[PDB]
Amino acid sequence: DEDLRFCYDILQAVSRSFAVVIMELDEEMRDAVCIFYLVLRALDTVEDDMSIPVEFKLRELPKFHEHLHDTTWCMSGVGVGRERELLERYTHVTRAYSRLGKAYQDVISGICERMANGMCDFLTRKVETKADYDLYCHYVAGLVGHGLTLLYVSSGLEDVRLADDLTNANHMGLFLQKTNIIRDFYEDICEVPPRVFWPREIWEKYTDDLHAFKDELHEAKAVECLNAMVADALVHVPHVVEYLASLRDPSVFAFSAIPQVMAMATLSLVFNNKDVFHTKVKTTRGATARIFHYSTELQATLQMLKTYTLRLAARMNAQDACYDRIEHLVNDAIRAMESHQ
Amino acid sequence: DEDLRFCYDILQAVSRSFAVVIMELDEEMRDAVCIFYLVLRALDTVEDDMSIPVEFKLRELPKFHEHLHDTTWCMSGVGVGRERELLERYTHVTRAYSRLGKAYQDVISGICERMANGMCDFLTRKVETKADYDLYCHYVAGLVGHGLTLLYVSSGLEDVRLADDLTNANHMGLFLQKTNIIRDFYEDICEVPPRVFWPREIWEKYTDDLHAFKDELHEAKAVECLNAMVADALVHVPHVVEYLASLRDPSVFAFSAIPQVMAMATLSLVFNNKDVFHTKVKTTRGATARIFHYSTELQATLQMLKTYTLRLAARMNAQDACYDRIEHLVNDAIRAMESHQ
Amino acid sequence: DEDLRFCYDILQAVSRSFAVVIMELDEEMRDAVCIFYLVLRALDTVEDDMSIPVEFKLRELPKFHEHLHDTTWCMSGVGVGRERELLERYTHVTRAYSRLGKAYQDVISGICERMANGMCDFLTRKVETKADYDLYCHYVAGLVGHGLTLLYVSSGLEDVRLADDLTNANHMGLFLQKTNIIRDFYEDICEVPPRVFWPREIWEKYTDDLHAFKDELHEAKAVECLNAMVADALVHVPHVVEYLASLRDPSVFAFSAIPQVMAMATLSLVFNNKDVFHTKVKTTRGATARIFHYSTELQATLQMLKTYTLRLAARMNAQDACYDRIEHLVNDAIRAMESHQ
Amino acid sequence: DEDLRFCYDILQAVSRSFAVVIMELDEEMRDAVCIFYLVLRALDTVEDDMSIPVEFKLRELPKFHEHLHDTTWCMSGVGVGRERELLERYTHVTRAYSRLGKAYQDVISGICERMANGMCDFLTRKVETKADYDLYCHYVAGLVGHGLTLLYVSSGLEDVRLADDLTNANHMGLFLQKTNIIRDFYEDICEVPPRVFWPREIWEKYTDDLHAFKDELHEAKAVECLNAMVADALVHVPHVVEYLASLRDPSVFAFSAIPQVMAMATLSLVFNNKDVFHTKVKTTRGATARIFHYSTELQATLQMLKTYTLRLAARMNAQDACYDRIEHLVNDAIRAMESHQ
Numbered sequence A, B, C, D: 001d002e003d004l005r006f007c008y009d010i011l012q013a014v015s016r017s018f019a020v021v022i023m024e025l026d027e028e029m030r031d032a033v034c035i036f037y038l039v040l041r042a043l044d045t046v047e048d049d050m051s052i053p054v055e056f057k058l059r060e061l062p063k064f065h066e067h068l069h070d071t072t073w074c075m076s077g078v079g080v081g082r083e084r085e086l087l088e089r090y091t092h093v094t095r096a097y098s099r100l101g102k103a104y105q106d107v108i109s110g111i112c113e114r115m116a117n118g119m120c121d122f123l124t125r126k127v128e129t130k131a132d133y134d135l136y137c138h139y140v141a142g143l144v145g146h147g148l149t150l151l152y153v154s155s156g157l158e159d160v161r162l163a164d165d166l167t168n169a170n171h172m173g174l175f176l177q178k179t180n181i182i183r184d185f186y187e188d189i190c191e192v193p194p195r196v197f198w199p200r201e202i203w204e205k206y207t208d209d210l211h212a213f214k215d216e217l218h219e220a221k222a223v224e225c226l227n228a229m230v231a232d233a234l235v236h237v238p239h240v241v242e243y244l245a246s247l248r249d250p251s252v253f254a255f256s257a258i259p260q261v262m263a264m265a266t267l268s269l270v271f272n273n274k275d276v277f278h279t280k281v282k283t284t285r286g287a288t289a290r291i292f293h294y295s296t297e298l299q300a301t302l303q304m305l306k307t308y309t310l311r312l313a314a315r316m317n318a319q320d321a322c323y324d325r326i327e328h329l330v331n332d333a334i335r336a337m338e339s340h341q
C-alpha cells in the first residue's frame, strides 16, 4: 500500500516522461511495469555514477538482481538527486516486488541481471563498431523491449504468440534509444566527463575527434554524420510498425505506440538539423498532446508515423549526400505502414 | 534552409509577442505563419512610412503581393531600425515563400493583397463612423483572422468546415486589434503626427478635440469615452469563445487562445482606468506567464476568460454611466463561456 | 482608493527591496500582501524604538492587531522617519484593510498578533542559545512566511495543500533574516544602543566580547565565527528549495524565489570575508538585476542557487577550521537542488 | 588575498576613473580585468618614461609578458608616483595573475605581448597618416577591446559568438582613445618632448606647425582642424552602438557602456570648442554621476548617447565647414541607435 505509492512518487520524479505514458496501463499491469522500471533505473544509477571505482560495479552489478529478494538491502552514497533516494530507500521497491505475480517477478529479475551484465561488458570498453552500437542499445533499451513484451504476455492481455520472436520487441527499444542518443548529442558531450555513444565506425568517416562538431566551423561535416546516424535509426522503423500491428489490447497498445510516434516525431526534427549540435531539439507541447490523443488505435498512429517520416524525407535535397540512402529507408518505412492500411 | 533562419531572427526582433506565441505551432504550420506575418509586416512598414508619397502607395501597394513571386525584389530606403532590414533583405522571405505549398502561398498572397487595398482605402480618408472603425480593423486584423483560419484548414489540422463562415474568424481579429487600439491611446496620439484610431462617432460624444484627453482636465470625459471603447470591444467576446470552441487541434488552439486571453486580461486593466491616458497599462509577467501555461485546452482558457471578464465588471459601480451598457455585454460574454463548460 | 494609494507610496519609502518584488504579484494578491507588510512594519517601529519605555510596549503590542478594526485609530509619539509617518497616518492602512477579503483579513490579523507577543518575549531577555536564535527569527521572519503561504492558499492561486506543514514556509523567513543579520553585523553593532543578534552559543567559542570583532586584531577569530553563522543559515537552504518547488503559479513563485536567490547571493559574498566586520557587503546592481530577470521559473532559479552555493564553497580552503562542516551543508543543498532538476 | 588587495589599491591610485567603473563587474571577472588593466598599465609606464633610453624600451617591452610567470620579477628606476611603485612591487600582480583561471591568463598575456610590440613600433616614428592614427589607437586601445571582449566570452557571461569578429570591439577602443587624444591635445603638446598624436594627414590642411594652434592667432584654423578630428571619431559610434546592443549580461554591459557614454559626452563638449587649445574640457561631476546611474540597460544608455550627439550637432552653425559631413555621421549614428530603440 505505502510502498507501491512511493514507487510512483519516486517514478514521477525520476522520469517525468515515462511516468505519464505508464498511466495508460491498467492498475495491475501498471504496478508491475512501475517496479520493473525502477529496478532498471536503480541499476542505471549505479553505472552512471563516476565517483565509484570501476571494479566495484563489476562486482555488485552482476549481483544486483539478488537484492530483489533482500527487502533489507539498499545503497546510500550513489546517485544524483531523487535517484539517491531511490537506492537509500530501495526497500520500498523490493517490498512491492515481493507482492507481484511470480511470473512478473521472474521477468523483472531476468531482464535486470541480463541488462546488468551488458553494462559491465561495455564498462571496460567503448562503442567503436556499429555492432557495438546496436548491442549497447540492446543492453540499455532493447532488453526493455523484451522485458515489456514478456510482461504483456504474462498479464494475459496479449497472446503468448507475441513472445515467440523478440526481434521486433528489440527493435522497438533500439529505436527509442538511437533516436535519443542522436537528439541528445550536445547534451551528452558537454557533461563531465564528456559522454559519447555515436559509433566510431560512423563518425570517423566525417572527423578525427567527435568534439570537433561542437564547432560551427566543422558544421557541414557535422550534419552529414548526423544524417548517417538517423539513417541507421530508420532501419528499425519497419519492424516497429510490425510490432505495433501485432498488439491487440488497447491499454498495452497505446502505452507502446506513443513512445514510438514520439521518437519518429523527434527523429524528423533532428534530421539534417545543424541545431542538434548546440541545443536540444524538441517537439511542441501541442505536438505531443496530439500524439497522446490519437495513438490509441493502429490506423491513427500509422498516419501520424507516415506524416512524420514524410516531413523527415521532405527536409533534404536531391544533391544531398545521404539522399539516395534515406529515400530507400523512407519507402521501406512507408511500405511497412501502408502494408497495414 | 539558411533563408528560413532569417525569417525567425527578423521575426523575434520585430514582434516580442508573436515571436513567442508562434512557437506553439508545428514547424510545417509555423513556417507558413512566420512568412505570412513578415509579408504583412513588410507591407505595414511601407504603408506607415509617411515620407513616402501617398500616390506611390496607392499605386504600388495594391501590387505588393506580387513581389512574392519575384525572388530578387526588395526595398532600400524605407522603415526604421529592423523593419528596414526586413525590406532590404526581403529576399529570404520570398525565397522561403517559394518553398511552401501552393495552398499556403495562395492564402498569404491572397490576404496580403486584400489587406493592401484595404490600407489604401484608408490612406485617403479618416475613420469617422463606427462602421469605418470596424472596416479598418477588418483590413488590418480581421483579415489576419481569415488568413490563419484558412491556413489551419489548408494544413489539415482543422476541419474544412472551419472555413465556411469566416465571421467569427474576423471577431478574433477585431478583439485583439480593438483592445490594443484602446490600450495604446496615449502612445499613438503622442507620435508625430499623432496617430488616432478611436472613431469620431464615439469620442465626439465626449469631447470636441480628442487630444483633450491628454490633459488631466478632461479626465472624467476621458474615462467615459474609454469605457465606450471597451464596450465596443466586448461585442466580440461571445464570438471569440465560439471560434476557440470549434478548434480541435492542440497546437492550433494554444496559438489562437493565448492571444485572446491576453487581450481580455489587458482589457480588464485598461477598463475605467485613468492611467490609460498617460502611460501603457500592462499585465505582470507572472500573469501573462500563467496565461501561456494554461491556455492549452478549451476548459482551462474558458475559466480564465471568465475570471478576467468579472474582474473587469467589478471595476465599475451603479453610479457609473456605462454600468448598464457594460453589464449587458459582460453577461452576454459569460453566457457564451458557460455554454461550453 | 486613496488609502491604498498611500500604502504603496509609504511602501516605496519604508522598504526599497520588498516594494519591488511585490510588483511581481497580481492585483488582488498584491494589495493584501502590501497591507500585510505595512501592518507588520508599523509593529516593528514600536518594538525597535529604544527611546520608548520598555513597558509601554509589553502592554500595547499584544493588543495591536485589535486596532485593525478602528479606521480612525493611530499613533504619533513613535518613529524615526517614514516609520514614524506610517503609525501617525496608520488610518489609511486599516482603512484599506477593511476592503480586503474576509479570508485575507484573518491571515493578517492572525500573524500580527502572533508576532506581537513574540517580540514582547525578547524585550525582557537576550539572544543566548541557537534555540533562542531560531526562535527570534521565526517571530519576525518565519511568521511572515506563514502569513504569505496562508495568503497564497487563501487566494486559490496555490493548492490548499501548501497550508498543511508551515515548516518550510518558516525556513524561508529564517534563511532571509539570518543572512541579513550575518551581513548587517557592523551596521547594527554600530548604534546606541548597539544591536546584537549573533547568539552567544556560537560567538563565545571565538571571543569573550562580540565588539572584539570590530578590531583588526581579532580578524582570524572573526572570520571563523562568521563562517559559523553562515553554516547556521545553510541549514535552511534545503528547505527553501522544497518550498519553491512546491509552487506552481508564476507570480507567487517569482515573488518568493527572487528574495531567496538574493539572500543566497549575499551569503556567498559575506562568507569567509573580513570586510563584513567594517562595511556592508553588497552584490553589484548588475548581479541583482540578472537575478530579478531569471528567477521566474524553478529550473532557472535552481541553476543560479547552485552557482552561488559553488561560489561560496570556493572561497574556503582545507586549512580552514570549518571546511568540513560547510562542505557538508553545501552538498546538502546542492543535492536538494539536483533533486528537482 | 594580500596581493589582490594591493592591485585594487594600486589601481584606485593610478586610475580614479577606471577604478570606479570596474566595480560594475562580478569579482571573478573584476579580478581578471583588474590584473589585465594593471599589466597594461605597467607596460604603459615603461614606455611613457622619457628619462629612459630608447634601446631599453625596445628590448624589455617585447619580453614584458614573460615576467607574468615570474612571481619574483620587478622593475626599479622607472616612472614616478604610484606608477613606479607598480613596477617595483610588480610581484603582487604576478602573484594574483597566477591564481587566475588559465583561460584568463592567456588573454592577458596574449594582449600584453601584442600591445607591447605595437608601442615599440611607434617609438621610432611619428603619427603621420590616418592609417597610422588608426593603427596606434588599435595598439593602445583597440586591443583592450579584444581582451575585454575575449574575457567576457571566457567567463560564460557572454556568448562565445561575441568573440568571432572583434572588429567592433576595436571600434569601442578607438572611439574612446581618439576622444581622449582630441581632448588632451593641449596637455600632450605642452610636455617635453611635445607629444603629438593628431595625424599630419589631417592637420596639414590647416597649418604647417601644429604648435600654431596654441597661439590664439590660429584659433580660427585650429578649431577647424579640431572638428576634422571629431568627424574622424564619430565614424566609430555606429559600431560602438552595435557592440553595446550585442551585450546580454547586466554587469558586463554597464562596465562597457559607461566609458562610451562618458566619451560621447566629452566629445560633444570638445567639439567645435576653442578652449581645447588651452585647457582640459571636462563634464560636470553631476553629469558623469547621471551617466553611471542610467547606463545600466541598452535603452536608457542609447537615448543618452542620442541626447549628447544632438547636443554636439547643435553646437555648430550652418556656415561651419565641417557642417555637412558632421550631420551625415550624426544621423548615421542616430540611425544605428534607433535601429534598436
Ligand SMILES: CCCCCCCCCCCCCCC[n+]1ccn(CC(P(=O)([O-])O)P(=O)(O)O)c1
Pocket: A014, A015, A016, A017, A018, A019, A040, A041, A044, A140, A141, A142, A144, A145, A146, A148, A149, A169, A172, A173, A176, A177, A256, A259
Ligand atoms: C516495447 C517497446 C520498447 C521500448 C522500451 C523503452 C526503452 C527506453 C530506454 C530506457 C532505458 C532504461 C534505463 C533508464 C535510463 N534513463 C534515465 C533517464 N532516462 C530518460 C527518461 P526521460 O529523460 O526521457 O524522461 P525516459 O526515456 O526513461 O522516460 C532513461
Ligand SMILES: CCCCCCCCCCCCCCC[n+]1ccn(CC(P(=O)([O-])O)P(=O)(O)O)c1
Pocket: B014, B015, B016, B017, B018, B019, B040, B041, B044, B140, B141, B142, B144, B145, B146, B148, B149, B169, B172, B173, B176, B177, B256
Ligand atoms: C484567428 C486568430 C486571429 C488573430 C490575428 C491577430 C491580429 C493582430 C493584428 C496585428 C497586425 C499585423 C500587422 C503588423 C503591424 N504591427 C506592428 C507592430 N505590431 C504589434 C506587435 P507587438 O509590438 O505586440 O510585438 P504584434 O501585435 O504584431 O505581435 C503590429
Ligand SMILES: CCCCCCCCCCCCCCC[n+]1ccn(CC(P(=O)([O-])O)P(=O)(O)O)c1
Pocket: C014, C015, C016, C017, C018, C019, C040, C041, C044, C140, C141, C144, C145, C148, C149, C169, C172, C173, C176, C177, C256
Ligand atoms: C514565503 C517566503 C517568506 C519570506 C518572508 C520575508 C521576511 C523578510 C523579513 C522582513 C521583516 C518584516 C518586518 C520589517 C522589519 N524590517 C525593517 C527593515 N527591513 C529590511 C527591508 P530592506 O532594508 O532590505 O528594504 P526588507 O528586507 O523588509 O525589504 C525589514
Ligand SMILES: CCCCCCCCCCCCCCC[n+]1ccn(CC(P(=O)([O-])O)P(=O)(O)O)c1
Pocket: D014, D015, D016, D017, D018, D019, D040, D041, D044, D140, D141, D144, D145, D146, D148, D149, D169, D172, D173, D176, D177, D256
Ligand atoms: C570593449 C571595451 C573596450 C574599451 C577599452 C578601454 C580603452 C581605454 C584606453 C586606456 C589605455 C590603457 C593604458 C593605460 C594608459 N593610461 C594612462 C592614463 N590613462 C588615463 C586614465 P584616467 O586619467 O582617465 O583615470 P584611464 O583612461 O586608464 O581610466 C590611461
